[PDB]
Amino acid sequence: APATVCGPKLSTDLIKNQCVNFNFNGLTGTGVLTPSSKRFQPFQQFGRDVSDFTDSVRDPKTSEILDISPCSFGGVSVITPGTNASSEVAVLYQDVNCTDVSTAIHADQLTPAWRIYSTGNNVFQTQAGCLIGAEHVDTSYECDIPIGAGICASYHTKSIVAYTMSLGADSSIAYSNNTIAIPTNFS
Amino acid sequence: TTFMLKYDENGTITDAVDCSQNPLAELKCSVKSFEIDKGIYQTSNFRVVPSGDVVRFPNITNLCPFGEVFNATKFPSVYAWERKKISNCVADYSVLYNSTFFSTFKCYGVSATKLNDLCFSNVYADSFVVKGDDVRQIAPGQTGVIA
Amino acid sequence: TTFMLKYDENGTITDAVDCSQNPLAELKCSVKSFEIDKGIYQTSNFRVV
Amino acid sequence: ISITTEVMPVSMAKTSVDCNMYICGDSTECANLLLQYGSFCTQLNRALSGIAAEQDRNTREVFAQVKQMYKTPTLKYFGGFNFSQILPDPLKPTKRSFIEDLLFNKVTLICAQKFNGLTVLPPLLTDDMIAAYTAALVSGTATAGWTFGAGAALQIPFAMQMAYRFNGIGVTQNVLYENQKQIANQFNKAISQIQESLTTTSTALGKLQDVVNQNAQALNTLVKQLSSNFGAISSVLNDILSRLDKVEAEVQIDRLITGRLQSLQTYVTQQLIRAAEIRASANLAATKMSECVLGQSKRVDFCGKGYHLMSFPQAAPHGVVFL
Amino acid sequence: LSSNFGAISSVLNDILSRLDKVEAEVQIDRLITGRLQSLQTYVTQQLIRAAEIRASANLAATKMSECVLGQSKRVDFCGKGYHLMSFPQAAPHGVVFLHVTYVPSQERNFTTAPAICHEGKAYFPREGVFVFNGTSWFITQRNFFSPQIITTDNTFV
Amino acid sequence: ISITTEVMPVSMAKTSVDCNMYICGDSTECANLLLQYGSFCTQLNRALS
Ligand SMILES: *[C@@H]1O[C@H](CO)[C@@H](O)[C@H](O)[C@H]1NC(C)=O
Ligand SMILES: *[C@@H]1O[C@H](CO)[C@@H](O)[C@H](O)[C@H]1NC(C)=O
Ligand SMILES: *[C@@H]1O[C@H](CO)[C@@H](O)[C@H](O)[C@H]1NC(C)=O
Ligand SMILES: *[C@@H]1O[C@H](CO)[C@@H](O)[C@H](O)[C@H]1NC(C)=O
Ligand SMILES: *[C@@H]1O[C@H](CO)[C@@H](O)[C@H](O)[C@H]1NC(C)=O
Ligand SMILES: *[C@@H]1O[C@H](CO)[C@@H](O)[C@H](O)[C@H]1NC(C)=O
Ligand SMILES: *[C@@H]1O[C@H](CO)[C@@H](O)[C@H](O)[C@H]1NC(C)=O
Ligand SMILES: *[C@@H]1O[C@H](CO)[C@@H](O)[C@H](O)[C@H]1NC(C)=O
Ligand SMILES: *[C@@H]1O[C@H](CO)[C@@H](O)[C@H](O)[C@H]1NC(C)=O
C-alpha cells in the first residue's frame, strides 16, 4: 500500500537517464526510469507485465506514472578474420539500440569494459545489433561472415567491411517462344 | 582482471593474454586459443549503472513510533493482546536492535540489518507477556503448546 | 477457487473465468485463452477419498 | 492437373537467452554466487547459439539451391499459364508474391529488451531476401527449369518445358499441344483455388503455426519459471537480497539459482530437440526444392499426390509452401 | 570437476580430509548433485548429437546405396550436375564422396518449334526438341547438341 | 525373384505419467510443496502428451 515506515534515507530526484539504481519503497532494482501512459487506479501502485518483474511504478512523492526498462543488456559478438591473416581490430556487436551504446562507451557504463577501446568511428542500427568497428560499404559481394538481417561482414578494402549481401550474382535469361538453348559441350 | 596464461613443454609461461584489453583478446580467453580461424563469437556482459534513485515515500516524516510501544507500562495479557497500528511515521530501527534489551530477538523473512532500508505499508505491534518456555513458542508452527 | 482474469489496454478487468465451473472453463484456465480452436486438452486431477 | 500446397517448416526462432540476466540480472551477489557452477552459463549460452547458427544453415540449405538470381520476367503469361506467384513490381510495393503475401498474413525497428533476459535474434536471410529467392526459383522454373538445377540455366519456352515434363510421366508430348488450352485453364483455375483455399481454411497455417506456437509456449514456460518460488522466500530475486543480509540469502538464493538453472537446462534441451525436428524438416524441404522444383521427381508421393509435373516454392514465414 | 557447486572446494578428497563425514555429507552432496547434473547434461547432449549423426549416417547410407552402387536420376542429391557415378573415400569418422557429374557447359541459341507440319497432321518428337540450325530442321536430345536426320521413327502422330 | 522382410518401427508406447501421482500421490502436503516449482508438472505432462 502507500508506505508508512521509511528507515530514513534522503530521497533524491528521479531522472529519465538510462541505468539508474532505483530504490523505491520496496524495489531495490536497477534500470531505466521513463514516463509512461499507464492508467493506475489509485489503489494499485506497482505494475507488472507478463511475469515476476515490476514493469511500471507510480512515484511515491509526485504520483507520476512511469515504466521501467532494464539496463540495456545483450550479448557481445565479435567479428574476426584470420588472426594469422590479421590481428587488426575485432569489430563488435551490441544487440542494443546504438545511441544507448555510443553514449555509454564515451562514459564508462559498459561492463565488459575494454581498456584500449577508443573505437568507435562507425555506428550501425542494423536489426542484429550495432556494429562498431565495421565500415558501411554500399557495394555488395557475398556472405562471408553472417551477422543477421541480411548483412554479412568480411575483410576487404584491409579493413573490415559491413554490407548487405548480394545473393550469389544477378543474372538474366530471355524467355522466348521460339528459341531453345541446348548445350554443345560438357565438363 | 581475468587473465590467460600459456605454458610450455618445459612448463614455463611463454605468452599471456589480458582478458579485458581489447575484444580480440576477450575472444582469445573465450575460445581458449591464440590463433582463431574466422567468424563470430560471444561474451554476454553489458551495462553497469552510473546513478541511483532512492526516492521513497514519506511526505509527513514523523519519527520513532515504537518509542512509546516498547517502553509502555501497561501490557495486556496473552489472550487479550493489543495490536497497535503505526501510521505515517518513519520507524528508524537499530534503536530497537543493536542495544541488547531483548533476550530473544529473532526475525522471520526480513533481517534486522536491512530492516531499515525497505519500506512497509503498515507495521503492527502485538504486545503481551508470556513464560520463558513460551518465548520459543511464539513462532510459526509449535502448535501443541498452550501459548 | 482458482480464478482467471482478463485485463484491458486500459488495465481494467473486462472478463473473468472460474476454473472449476465447468470443464470448458477448466480448459480456458489450462490453455490460458478464451477462444479455443478445437481438439482435446488436459488436466490431471482425480479421486478424493 | 491439380496443384497442392505442401507446407514445410525450415527454421524457427533464433532465441538466445542471456543466461546471467535470466537467473539474476539486477543482482551482483547472485552473479558471484552463480559463478561457482562453472560453465552452466556460457555453455548453456553456447548451446542455443549453436541452434541459432544453424537456423540460417537450414535456410541456406533450402533456398540457396539456385546460384545466380534470375530476374522476374515481365511477360508473365507463359503460354496460357498465368503465374500470379512471381512477385509483380507496380501493384505490390513489397517485393513478395500475391500468394506469398497471403501466406505471410496467415500466421500469428528499435530494441525492446524485457527484464527476463530473453531475446529473439533476427534471421540472416530476411523475409524480403527469402521472397527474392523464391522469385528466382519460379522464374527459373518458368523460363529454364532443367539445367537450371544441374548447372547454368538454359532457356526453354514454357510449353516446350511442360511437354517434356509430361514425357517424364510417360504420357506423350502429343497430349500437351492437343490439349494446351485445356491444360492451361486447369492450371489457372488451380492457383485460383489456392488463392481461395489458403485465404480462409488455415491449412498452410497449420504446420507452421505449430512451429511458432511451440516456440512461443516454450518461452512462456521459461518466463513463468521466474515467478516460480523453488522453495525460496519469494520468487522475486531482489526481495531476497533486500531482507536477508547475504548470510541467510546464500541459502535462499541458491535454492532459486538451481531452480533457474534447471529451467534453462530444461529449455535449451527442449530447443535442441526441436532443432533436430526442424533440421530434419529443413533437410526434407532442401530435397523438395532440389527435386520437386529444380528437377522432376519420378519418386511417387514425394512431391505431390498425383504424377508430378513441377513445383513452385513460396516464401512462407519460417517455412516453405511448395505448390 | 573444477566447479565448486557451493561446496568448500572442487577437489573431492579435500572435502573428505577435513570435514569428518558428518559435515562432509552436507558438502559432498552439493558436489554430487552438481556432478550428476553435469553428466546428465553431457549424456543428453550426446544423445542429441547421436541423432544428428545417425540422420547424417542414414543419409550417407543412402548415398553409398544410390550414388555409388547405382546411378541417381534424383537431382541434386549426389552431385550438382547430372550424375554419372560416385566414389566413397575413407575419411575419419565420415565419408567423402567423389560425385562424378556431367555439367553441360557450352550452349548455343536455337530456334525450335514443336510438331513440324508435314502432309496434314504434324509430327510430335519421340524424345526430341525439333532444333533448327541454319536452314535445316533436326531433332536432338536436350542435354547435348547431336542433330539427327528427321525420320518417321524419330517422331509419331 | 526373392522377397525380403524389411522391418520399420513407426510408433512407440503413448506413456503419459501422471506427474503429481508419481512424485507424491497419496500425500497432499507434498502436493502443496510441489506447487512452488511452477510448471514442472503440467509442462512435463504437456511434453510427453
Ligand atoms: C510467342 O509465339 C508466337 C508464335 O505464334 C510468336 O508469333 C510471338 O512473337 C511470340 N512472342 C510473343 C511476345 O507473343
Ligand atoms: C569442349 O571443350 C573442350 C575444352 O574444355 C574442347 O577441347 C572440346 O573440343 C570441346 N568440344 C567437345 C565436343 O568436346
Ligand atoms: C625446454 O624444452 C625445449 C623444447 O621445447 C628444450 O629444447 C630445452 O632443452 C628445454 N629446457 C629445459 C631447461 O628443460
Ligand atoms: C508532497 O506531495 C505533494 C503531492 O501529493 C507534492 O507536490 C510535494 O512535492 C510533496 N512534498 C515534497 C516535500 O516533495
Ligand atoms: C526504552 O528506553 C531506554 C532508556 O532506558 C532506551 O535506551 C530504549 O531505546 C527504549 N526502547 C525503545 C525506544 O524501543
Ligand atoms: C546502534 O543503533 C543506533 C540507533 O540510534 C545508531 O547509533 C547505530 O545504528 C548503532 N550505533 C553504533 C555506535 O554503531
Ligand atoms: C480506455 O481504452 C479505450 C480503448 O480500448 C479508449 O477508447 C478509452 O478512451 C480509454 N479510457 C480511459 C479512461 O483511459
Ligand atoms: C490471370 O490472367 C490475367 C491475364 O493473363 C493476368 O493479368 C493475371 O496474372 C491474372 N488475373 C488477375 C486478375 O490477377
Ligand atoms: C541468345 O539470344 C539472346 C537474345 O537474342 C541473347 O541474350 C543470348 O546472349 C544469346 N545466346 C545464348 C547463348 O543464350
Tab-separated table of C-alpha atoms in Angstrom, chain D residues 73-299:
chain	number	residue	atom	x	y	z
D	73	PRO	CA	10.299	-11.745	-66.279
D	74	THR	CA	7.778	-9.196	-67.477
D	75	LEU	CA	5.686	-11.291	-69.898
D	76	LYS	CA	4.188	-13.490	-67.204
D	77	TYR	CA	1.529	-15.056	-69.437
D	78	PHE	CA	3.674	-18.077	-70.305
D	79	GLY	CA	1.562	-19.852	-72.919
D	80	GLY	CA	-1.761	-19.775	-71.067
D	81	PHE	CA	-0.170	-20.321	-67.656
D	82	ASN	CA	-0.951	-17.242	-65.621
D	83	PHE	CA	1.754	-17.040	-62.885
D	84	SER	CA	0.308	-14.728	-60.230
D	85	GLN	CA	3.018	-16.163	-57.961
D	86	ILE	CA	6.152	-14.473	-59.276
D	87	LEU	CA	6.263	-11.105	-57.455
D	88	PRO	CA	4.979	-8.178	-59.579
D	89	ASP	CA	6.645	-4.788	-59.212
D	90	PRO	CA	3.991	-1.986	-59.657
D	91	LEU	CA	0.929	-3.296	-57.798
D	92	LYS	CA	2.699	-4.570	-54.685
D	93	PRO	CA	5.094	-2.106	-53.004
D	94	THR	CA	6.612	-5.023	-51.115
D	95	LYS	CA	8.762	-7.466	-53.075
D	96	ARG	CA	6.796	-10.652	-52.475
D	97	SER	CA	4.192	-12.598	-54.434
D	98	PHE	CA	0.426	-12.373	-54.086
D	99	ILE	CA	0.410	-15.942	-52.802
D	100	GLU	CA	3.384	-15.206	-50.532
D	101	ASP	CA	1.670	-12.101	-49.141
D	102	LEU	CA	-1.361	-14.283	-48.487
D	103	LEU	CA	0.990	-16.655	-46.648
D	104	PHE	CA	2.704	-14.024	-44.503
D	105	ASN	CA	-0.690	-12.825	-43.276
D	106	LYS	CA	-1.965	-16.257	-42.182
D	107	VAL	CA	0.355	-16.653	-39.181
D	108	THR	CA	0.490	-15.369	-35.564
D	109	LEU	CA	12.668	-1.371	-35.741
D	110	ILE	CA	14.130	-0.434	-32.346
D	111	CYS	CA	15.020	-2.766	-29.482
D	112	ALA	CA	12.659	-3.610	-26.605
D	113	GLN	CA	14.667	-5.876	-24.237
D	114	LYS	CA	12.340	-7.003	-21.418
D	115	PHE	CA	13.674	-7.836	-17.950
D	116	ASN	CA	13.644	-11.616	-18.319
D	117	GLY	CA	16.866	-11.840	-20.325
D	118	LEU	CA	15.160	-13.429	-23.317
D	119	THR	CA	15.546	-12.265	-26.901
D	120	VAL	CA	14.732	-13.291	-30.467
D	121	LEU	CA	17.628	-12.823	-32.826
D	122	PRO	CA	16.745	-11.861	-36.388
D	123	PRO	CA	17.409	-14.362	-39.171
D	124	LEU	CA	20.319	-13.740	-41.502
D	125	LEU	CA	18.020	-14.201	-44.501
D	126	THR	CA	15.324	-11.538	-44.267
D	127	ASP	CA	11.759	-12.103	-45.418
D	128	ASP	CA	12.466	-9.895	-48.431
D	129	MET	CA	15.553	-11.933	-49.333
D	130	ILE	CA	13.671	-15.205	-48.926
D	131	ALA	CA	10.993	-13.760	-51.205
D	132	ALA	CA	13.764	-12.768	-53.608
D	133	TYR	CA	14.991	-16.376	-53.666
D	134	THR	CA	11.571	-17.842	-54.468
D	135	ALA	CA	11.157	-15.218	-57.167
D	136	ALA	CA	14.308	-16.620	-58.759
D	137	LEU	CA	13.243	-20.243	-58.322
D	138	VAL	CA	9.890	-19.669	-60.018
D	139	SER	CA	11.443	-17.533	-62.766
D	140	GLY	CA	13.993	-20.270	-63.319
D	141	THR	CA	11.154	-22.778	-63.389
D	142	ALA	CA	9.032	-20.672	-65.738
D	143	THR	CA	11.848	-19.927	-68.184
D	144	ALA	CA	14.564	-22.559	-67.816
D	145	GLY	CA	13.695	-25.411	-65.468
D	146	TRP	CA	16.166	-28.171	-66.122
D	147	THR	CA	19.865	-27.350	-66.457
D	148	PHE	CA	18.899	-24.567	-64.056
D	149	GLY	CA	19.147	-27.340	-61.484
D	150	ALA	CA	22.288	-29.004	-62.843
D	151	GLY	CA	24.473	-26.093	-63.938
D	152	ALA	CA	23.820	-22.798	-65.689
D	153	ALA	CA	20.250	-22.275	-66.828
D	154	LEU	CA	19.080	-22.783	-70.393
D	155	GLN	CA	16.000	-21.024	-71.745
D	156	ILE	CA	13.175	-23.333	-72.843
D	157	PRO	CA	9.717	-21.970	-73.753
D	158	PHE	CA	7.224	-22.999	-71.149
D	159	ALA	CA	5.020	-25.064	-73.442
D	160	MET	CA	8.138	-26.951	-74.522
D	161	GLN	CA	9.092	-27.267	-70.855
D	162	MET	CA	5.776	-28.706	-69.664
D	163	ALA	CA	5.630	-31.134	-72.592
D	164	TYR	CA	8.984	-32.561	-71.547
D	165	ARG	CA	7.528	-32.962	-68.057
D	166	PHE	CA	4.590	-34.883	-69.442
D	167	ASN	CA	7.209	-37.012	-71.186
D	168	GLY	CA	8.687	-37.856	-67.797
D	169	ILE	CA	5.301	-39.237	-66.743
D	170	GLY	CA	5.132	-41.395	-69.838
D	171	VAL	CA	2.175	-39.510	-71.249
D	172	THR	CA	3.365	-38.349	-74.650
D	173	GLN	CA	4.195	-34.852	-75.858
D	174	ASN	CA	1.175	-35.125	-78.175
D	175	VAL	CA	-1.125	-34.823	-75.183
D	176	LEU	CA	0.006	-31.322	-74.270
D	177	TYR	CA	-0.403	-29.489	-77.580
D	178	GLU	CA	-3.594	-31.414	-78.282
D	179	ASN	CA	-4.961	-30.013	-75.009
D	180	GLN	CA	-2.747	-26.992	-74.213
D	181	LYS	CA	-5.618	-24.557	-73.752
D	182	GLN	CA	-7.399	-27.097	-71.554
D	183	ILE	CA	-4.196	-27.826	-69.622
D	184	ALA	CA	-3.598	-24.104	-69.086
D	185	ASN	CA	-7.127	-23.434	-67.845
D	186	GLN	CA	-6.870	-26.330	-65.405
D	187	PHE	CA	-3.626	-24.745	-64.241
D	188	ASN	CA	-5.032	-21.236	-63.902
D	189	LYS	CA	-8.110	-22.492	-62.075
D	190	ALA	CA	-5.839	-24.438	-59.716
D	191	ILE	CA	-3.932	-21.380	-58.488
D	192	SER	CA	-7.248	-19.518	-58.229
D	193	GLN	CA	-8.382	-22.274	-55.878
D	194	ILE	CA	-5.136	-21.947	-53.899
D	195	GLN	CA	-5.675	-18.193	-53.637
D	196	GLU	CA	-9.164	-19.095	-52.403
D	197	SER	CA	-8.367	-22.102	-50.193
D	198	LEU	CA	-5.478	-20.783	-48.092
D	199	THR	CA	-7.230	-17.448	-47.561
D	200	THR	CA	-9.742	-18.865	-45.056
D	201	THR	CA	-9.210	-22.556	-44.316
D	202	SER	CA	-5.894	-22.080	-42.407
D	203	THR	CA	-4.064	-25.226	-43.538
D	204	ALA	CA	-0.769	-23.650	-44.600
D	205	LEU	CA	-1.191	-22.015	-41.213
D	206	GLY	CA	-1.282	-25.443	-39.580
D	207	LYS	CA	2.214	-26.865	-39.845
D	208	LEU	CA	3.995	-23.517	-39.495
D	209	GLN	CA	1.765	-22.228	-36.704
D	210	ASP	CA	2.510	-25.394	-34.752
D	211	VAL	CA	6.180	-24.428	-35.030
D	212	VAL	CA	5.587	-20.844	-33.899
D	213	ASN	CA	3.236	-21.828	-31.067
D	214	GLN	CA	5.617	-24.498	-29.796
D	215	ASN	CA	8.444	-21.981	-29.529
D	216	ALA	CA	6.274	-19.258	-28.004
D	217	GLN	CA	4.883	-21.669	-25.423
D	218	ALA	CA	8.377	-22.887	-24.563
D	219	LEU	CA	9.330	-19.264	-23.989
D	220	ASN	CA	6.277	-18.574	-21.822
D	221	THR	CA	7.196	-21.619	-19.767
D	222	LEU	CA	10.736	-20.282	-19.332
D	223	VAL	CA	9.478	-16.827	-18.379
D	224	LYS	CA	6.957	-18.139	-15.843
D	225	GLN	CA	9.674	-20.079	-14.033
D	226	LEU	CA	10.949	-16.691	-12.893
D	227	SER	CA	7.721	-16.366	-10.923
D	228	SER	CA	8.315	-19.853	-9.533
D	229	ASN	CA	9.359	-19.940	-5.896
D	230	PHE	CA	11.565	-23.096	-5.822
D	231	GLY	CA	11.368	-23.236	-2.040
D	232	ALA	CA	12.785	-19.757	-1.547
D	233	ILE	CA	11.073	-16.998	0.423
D	234	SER	CA	9.925	-15.176	-2.710
D	235	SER	CA	10.227	-15.621	-6.448
D	236	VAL	CA	11.405	-12.011	-6.754
D	237	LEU	CA	15.168	-12.146	-6.550
D	238	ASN	CA	15.808	-8.587	-5.352
D	239	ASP	CA	13.442	-9.128	-2.425
D	240	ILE	CA	15.674	-11.980	-1.269
D	241	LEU	CA	18.676	-9.644	-1.313
D	242	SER	CA	16.931	-6.703	0.321
D	243	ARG	CA	15.907	-8.522	3.521
D	244	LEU	CA	18.286	-11.415	4.275
D	245	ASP	CA	21.808	-9.909	4.678
D	246	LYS	CA	23.790	-12.291	2.376
D	247	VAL	CA	24.338	-14.968	5.051
D	248	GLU	CA	20.771	-16.248	5.132
D	249	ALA	CA	20.369	-15.221	1.483
D	250	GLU	CA	23.093	-17.658	0.361
D	251	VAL	CA	20.753	-20.457	1.484
D	252	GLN	CA	17.716	-18.924	-0.226
D	253	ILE	CA	19.296	-17.597	-3.434
D	254	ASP	CA	20.931	-20.972	-4.073
D	255	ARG	CA	17.513	-22.614	-3.972
D	256	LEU	CA	16.469	-20.039	-6.551
D	257	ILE	CA	19.588	-20.435	-8.704
D	258	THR	CA	19.389	-24.228	-9.030
D	259	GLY	CA	15.732	-23.853	-9.881
D	260	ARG	CA	16.523	-21.412	-12.663
D	261	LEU	CA	19.425	-23.478	-13.936
D	262	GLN	CA	17.136	-26.467	-14.162
D	263	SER	CA	14.593	-24.379	-16.067
D	264	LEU	CA	17.227	-23.121	-18.508
D	265	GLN	CA	18.744	-26.578	-18.822
D	266	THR	CA	15.214	-27.799	-19.463
D	267	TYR	CA	14.521	-25.122	-22.087
D	268	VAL	CA	17.759	-25.464	-24.039
D	269	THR	CA	17.370	-29.231	-24.127
D	270	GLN	CA	13.808	-28.835	-25.426
D	271	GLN	CA	15.103	-26.413	-28.063
D	272	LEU	CA	17.890	-28.779	-29.112
D	273	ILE	CA	15.260	-31.446	-29.694
D	274	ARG	CA	13.056	-29.036	-31.647
D	275	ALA	CA	16.126	-28.027	-33.648
D	276	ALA	CA	16.603	-31.644	-34.688
D	277	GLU	CA	12.921	-31.942	-35.592
D	278	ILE	CA	13.183	-28.868	-37.807
D	279	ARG	CA	16.597	-29.665	-39.295
D	280	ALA	CA	15.047	-32.973	-40.330
D	281	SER	CA	12.191	-30.926	-41.774
D	282	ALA	CA	14.577	-28.438	-43.349
D	283	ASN	CA	16.629	-31.228	-44.909
D	284	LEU	CA	13.409	-32.656	-46.301
D	285	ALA	CA	12.492	-29.264	-47.732
D	286	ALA	CA	16.047	-28.912	-49.021
D	287	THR	CA	15.497	-32.015	-51.124
D	288	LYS	CA	11.994	-30.981	-52.182
D	289	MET	CA	13.384	-27.758	-53.554
D	290	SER	CA	16.194	-29.793	-55.079
D	291	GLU	CA	13.977	-32.450	-56.628
D	292	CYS	CA	10.415	-31.187	-56.980
D	293	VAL	CA	11.334	-27.643	-58.008
D	294	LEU	CA	14.609	-27.931	-59.914
D	295	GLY	CA	14.033	-31.343	-61.468
D	296	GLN	CA	11.029	-33.585	-61.946
D	297	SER	CA	10.505	-36.347	-59.433
D	298	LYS	CA	9.765	-39.847	-60.694
D	299	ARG	CA	9.699	-40.719	-56.975
